[PDB]
Design a protein around this ligand. Sequence first.
Ligand code: B12
Ligand SMILES: C[C@H]1O[C@@H](n2cnc3c(N)ncnc32)[C@H](O)[C@@H]1O
Ligand code: MET
Ligand code: SF4
Ligand SMILES: [K+]
Length: 658
Amino acid sequence: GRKVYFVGLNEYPFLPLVAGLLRTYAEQDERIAAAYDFQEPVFLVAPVQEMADGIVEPDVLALSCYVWNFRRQMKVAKLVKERYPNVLVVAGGPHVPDRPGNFFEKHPYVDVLAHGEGEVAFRELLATRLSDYTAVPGVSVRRGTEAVVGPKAKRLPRLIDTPSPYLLGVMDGAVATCRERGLRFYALWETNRGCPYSCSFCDWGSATMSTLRKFEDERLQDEIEWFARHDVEDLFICDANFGIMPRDLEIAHALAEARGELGAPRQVRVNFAKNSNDRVFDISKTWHDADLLMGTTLSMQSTDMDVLEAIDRKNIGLDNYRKLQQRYAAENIHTYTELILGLPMETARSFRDGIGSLLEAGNHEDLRVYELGILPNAPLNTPEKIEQYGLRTVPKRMYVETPDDEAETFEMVMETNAMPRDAWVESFSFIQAVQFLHNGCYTRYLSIFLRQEHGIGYTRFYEGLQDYFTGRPDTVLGALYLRMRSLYHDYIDMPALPLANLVASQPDMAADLAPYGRRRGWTIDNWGWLRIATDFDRFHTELREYLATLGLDPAGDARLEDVLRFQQDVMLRPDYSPELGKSAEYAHDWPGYFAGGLLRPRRVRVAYGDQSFGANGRYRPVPGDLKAFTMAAIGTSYPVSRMGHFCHRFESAEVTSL
Ligand code: B12
Ligand SMILES: C[C@H]1O[C@@H](n2cnc3c(N)ncnc32)[C@H](O)[C@@H]1O
Ligand code: MET
Ligand code: SF4
Ligand SMILES: [K+]
């Protein structure tokens, strides 16, 4: 038969869902099923030469192209086309340009591009290859080096009734392949397709600004059971806005029941709906109780009205955000908020003010920031919009590498009309410090106390930290701010400094963290937290000196001394023993205060008895074991770990009046 090869490389093990969807949809044509021999998908990373050599006698080479695999898959296609002149090279995925232009001049070894959702176009291509391509909807066809655009794509109907690659068993080989090689994997799952909104930076599922289409109910329920029956522990749901549809609560309950009855799945990653509502809360409560929840998305991208207008995004208001934070915090349900640095119209002033406003509104635990990437088919990637807002980009490698044509690259915004490059660098350093100091707890409780009892706003506190300590190179915190300043300037100037391995690519920063573990995906956030952990006592000595510059010398303020001791003691330290615990005495009931109660000068004994850390309590500290300390203190670098980390859980500690 005509051998069909799929290549869709992922750095982390994700099951090849696209290959399964395209094959099983196409196999509904009995002539296609009989004529074509679909090979096992290539989705685990291997050397380019080795991947090309594994493609033997191909009739069709199907490339599933994303920012993380486009260049290597083009190079494989180049090598395969040299060996097999008659192979049909078809590239789809969100990195395929909507407007190909001179694409085939750069990639003459590619024959057909598929745009957006690919089921119909791929099935029509395979059928046409058997018949006695420019008539196929949803594709562009190479003619010489020119791109001939075919008819517009045919989307699947509002109710998507297509074969499931999971239920048909065509994902079995990939699952076994991961397990044979000792790899944990994510199963990818869709319950619907599209996003109804229009954020200009986004290209979610190649289907933003789209009417929502649902996968049929019975297929989804059967797939839930399939995941549970096959011990698929890690499930990644691809929906843009989970909770946006009424049935999403029923889906959440069905996943919780499957977890309860069969033990799988164990964790569910999903992006929760932009217009967060009671259904998102009910889903989150359900999955929190079932230990499935990985954080409730309450993302903003920006808080500035001009920025939000420029990117066509409406957010929940700040006061409504505050009410959400209060409701989730009361249930101990973890939420997180994403921001993007360098959006149109964002100034360094508006960016820092927005960060402070989110802390003011009650998010102290989980703020996440991304560099703005220009995606090929995002609305922002037009000459008009790039010109309108003055977006300046630099090519940025994703990974440490090797020829340039095998290094994956994206275009990273690092300057706009509103944010000069220098302001971008300092703003990025600012939010990293907010993450490891505030989300990381080191100064979170001091900052809250200073805000609520001494009138020091959140933005002002962390601006002052940066302004003061950047002028003191020999301090713990000053060294971090200055190293981040040079790192991000090099990051702009040197494209090879990778997005996904930045800390690991710097020998000094990698050496800082070497006693704590061997990781390729250390974040700057992790690095700052562990650098402070290393020089913890001196950090607090120097912190007292910064407080004196605010007029708040602790040597004359007994209450400030008291909260500083609480702030020091609450942090998890390498010598902590779950068998011994950790206790101290204070002049105020700090646990009750930071739980939301009134500040009362009540002399207390606080006894910390933490046995484990992390979301599921699956990291146990071992005194003297820096590797076990790191897992309990900060968890994994990927995925982001912020539930149950950093500090002792004083809300459960034994607090006794003296
Ligand atoms: C799961 C996921 C991840 C996983 C990785 C998944 C993997 N390794 O395979 C993780 C969580 C690691 C991840 C990370 C990132 N992601 Co992501 N991710 C997704 C998500 C939610 C699902 C992808 C998926 O499997 N979809 C389901 C499949 C079935 O749908 P599909 O991709 O649209 O496929 C269809 C069509 O494209 C077409 N098609 C696809 N391949 C082919 C091939 C052929 C031959 C044909 C004919 C057709 C065809 O047919 C398919 C079926 O209809 C998407 C959004 C989404 N819902 O698609 C973003 C998405 C892929 N991610 C995106 C981005 C930008 C990233 C990051 C690089 C940056 C960021 N998020 O800020 C980071 C990584 C940063 C870092 N430090 O490394 C972009 C990618 C855009 C692009 N041009 O590549 C997306 C589209 C989201 C967005 N912001 O618009 N991601
Ligand atoms: C899922 C999350 O990914 C982030 N996100 C989406 N598109 C981009 C992009 N082009 N650049 C950077 N971050 C992005 C947003 O913060 C979104 O909430
Ligand atoms: C998938 S993007 C993050 C979730 C939601 N669509 C939002 O923008 O807030
Ligand atoms: S950021 Fe979220 S709401 Fe905005 S277009 Fe992307 S998926 Fe839709
Ligand atoms: K689009």
